[PDB]
Amino acid sequence: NLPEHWTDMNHQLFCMVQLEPGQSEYNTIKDKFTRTCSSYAIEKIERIQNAFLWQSYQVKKRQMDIKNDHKNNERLLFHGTDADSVPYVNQHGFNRSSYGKGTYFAVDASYSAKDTYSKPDSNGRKHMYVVRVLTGVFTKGRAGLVTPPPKNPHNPTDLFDSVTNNTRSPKLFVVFFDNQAYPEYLITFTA
Amino acid sequence: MNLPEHWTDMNHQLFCMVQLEPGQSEYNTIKDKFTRTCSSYAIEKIERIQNAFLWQSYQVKKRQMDIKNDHKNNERLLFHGTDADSVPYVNQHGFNRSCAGKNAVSYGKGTYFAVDASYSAKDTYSKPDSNGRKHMYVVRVLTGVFTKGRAGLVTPPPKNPHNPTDLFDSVTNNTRSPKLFVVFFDNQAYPEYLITFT
Numbered sequence: 538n539l540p541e542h543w544t545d546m547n548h549q550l551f552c553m554v555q556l557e558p559g560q561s562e563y564n565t566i567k568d569k570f571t572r573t574c575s576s577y578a579i580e581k582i583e584r585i586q587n588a589f590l591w592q593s594y595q596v597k598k599r600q601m602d603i604k605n606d607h608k609n610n611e612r613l614l615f616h617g618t619d620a621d622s623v624p625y626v627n628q629h630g631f632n633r634s635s636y637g638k639g640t641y642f643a644v645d646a647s648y649s650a651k652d653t654y655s656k657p658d659s660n661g662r663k664h665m666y667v668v669r670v671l672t673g674v675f676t677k678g679r680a681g682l683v684t685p686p687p688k689n690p691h692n693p694t695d696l697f698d699s700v701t702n703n704t705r706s707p708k709l710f711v712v713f714f715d716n717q718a719y720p721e722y723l724i725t726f727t728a
Numbered sequence: 729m730n731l732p733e734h735w736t737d738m739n740h741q742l743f744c745m746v747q748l749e750p751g752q753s754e755y756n757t758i759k760d761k762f763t764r765t766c767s768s769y770a771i772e773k774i775e776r777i778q779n780a781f782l783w784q785s786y787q788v789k790k791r792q793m794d795i796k797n798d799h800k801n802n803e804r805l806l807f808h809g810t811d812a813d814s815v816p817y818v819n820q821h822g823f824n825r826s827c828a829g830k831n832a833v834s835y836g837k838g839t840y841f842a843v844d845a846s847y848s849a850k851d852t853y854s855k856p857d858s859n860g861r862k863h864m865y866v867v868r869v870l871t872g873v874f875t876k877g878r879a880g881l882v883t884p885p886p887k888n889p890h891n892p893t894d895l896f897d898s899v900t901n902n903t904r905s906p907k908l909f910v911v912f913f914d915n916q917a918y919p920e921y922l923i924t925f926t
């Protein structure tokens with residue numbers, strides 16, 4: 538039940554796999570990066586293969602495509618982070634524990650790349666994820682949120698799937714639930 | 729879908745509240761576990777929570793936790809007292825540690841479940857509504873391997889500090905005779921019943 542472009546895992550559950558620079562995979566992901574980051578240089582890109590994380594995101598993808606219509610739920614966003622969170626993110630993905638109390642993802646790589654988010658290690662090396670997020674139906678964000686707003690406040694059961702800063706042209710995305718985002722690649726880059 | 733064979737036909741709907749008959753095995757059992765520690769109260773009704781999406785995502789982790797842990801009994805049956813305003817979201821969307829109320833003696837920021845119904849029947853947790861009712865959930869909780877908790881936790885503590893990202897599944901007030909349990913992740917507990925009592 539896994540992605541068929543994944544490396545054999547030798548009967549293991551977690552695996553980090555570095556891309557070969559000439560590949561279409563490397564250039565597809567790199568072309569997405571170089572749209573808004575032409576200045577930076579990539580040390581590497583690695584495909585994160587997490588069986589359990591994959592499994593649970595997959596489950597929600599279907600629960601979402603069910604619930605909306607079959608709307609276009611999924612987006613490719615970026616998550617810059619500091620070198621020390623990475624081991625956890627690789628393993629357990631993103632955790633929520635201002636447009637809300639949740640996990641932030643950038644439409645553009647230039648945004649995530651801000652040293653505020655993608656923090657240089659002692660070696661000047663920064664980090665950013667290319668994350669598949671289940672965005673589905675969203676609305677505008679505000680400071681207070683612990684969960685996305687319910688569509689109709691007179692039915693506080695159905696919720697939006699995320700929140701944006703502006704709905705006409707969103708530049709970020711916030712999700713408030715475990716397993717709504719699968720980190721697909723890890724870009725290590727340099728000034 | 730995955731749906732259990734004892735569930736009422738939801739006829740193509742994803743969430744259902746179903747009223748149990750007292751005479752039934754299912755109703756009496758639940759009853760007998762409530763009356764172990766709670767006699768002075770009385771049961772108005774017992775509803776089975778039939779939530780597909782919750783049941784589905786929950787089960788996936790029950791399996792991932794049966795694999796990952798060497799032949800352990802990962803799943804435990806506990807109580808959750810809550811209030812009239814918190815029933816609807818939960819029935820629909822389960823438990824959320826970010827909405828979690830603080831505990832008198834706190835062992836971690838997350839959602840607390842009780843071994844005895846008495847503790848959960850405290851008006852502190854199960855608050856009576858304007859009609860005087862009290863509500864408690866009967867939850868399937870994945871406790872797995874657990875250590876003692878501390879008030880500073882956000883996720884469980886790691887098994888080996890030198891191996892940080894490897895964590896316990898939950899934490900208890902006491903490992904010898906646990907009376908409470910704390911879980912730190914979505915889909916780690918199934919709200920299987922809603923007891924409304926007095």
Ligand SMILES: Cc1cccc2c(=O)nc(CSc3ncccn3)[nH]c12
Pocket residue numbers: 807808809810811814828829830831832840841842847848851852853854855
């Ligand atoms: C922190 C804690 C310890 C032991 C039990 C509970 C509980 O049953 N419900 C809750 C939910 S918080 C709440 N919810 C509604 C009314 C009062 N408090 N918390 C517990």
